[PDB]
Structure 1
Amino acid sequence: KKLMAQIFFGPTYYQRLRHMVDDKIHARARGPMQVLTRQPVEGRSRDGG
């Protein structure tokens, strides 16, 4: 069915940026611990909390 409204439609230069989800997504439920503090480590890189 025709949309009641008419849409502003056309080409537009769009950019792909370097922030892709699967490079951010992280979950840690117990893992590596810091030596000194005995607390979780830092960053997804180190699989921290």
Structure 2
Amino acid sequence: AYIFFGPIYYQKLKHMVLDKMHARARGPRAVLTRQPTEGRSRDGGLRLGEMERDCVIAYGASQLLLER
């Protein structure tokens, strides 16, 4: 097939992966801390909300509840 070729002015944004990789093993002050620039963007985080508690009820798993 003939393939549509040509130049486009692209642009690189913010929001790289290097400052969003956030992880936590045990205890406070997590070991993989992202850069502290949220700015009205608290999208839950490393939590387990009531909407996600209702999903594992639908599977019927009773010991994953006590583990998590």
TM-score, with structure 2 as normaliser: 0.40
Q: Tell me the matched-pair count.
A: 36
Larger helix proportion, structure 1 or 2? Answer: 2
Q: Please state whether the residue corresponding to 2:9 is helix, strand or coil.
A: coil
Runs of 4+ in 1 over 4 A off after TM superposition: none
Structure 2 unmatched ranges of 5 or more: 37-44, 47-68
- Equivalent of residue 14 in structure 1, options 10, 13, 29: 10
Name the % identity.
67
Matched, 1:25 2:31: no
* Partner of residue 36, structure 1: none
* Partner of residue 62, structure 2: none
Of structures 1 and 2, the larger Rg is shown by 1
TM-score, with structure 1 as normaliser: 0.52
CA RMSD of aligned residues (A): 3.1
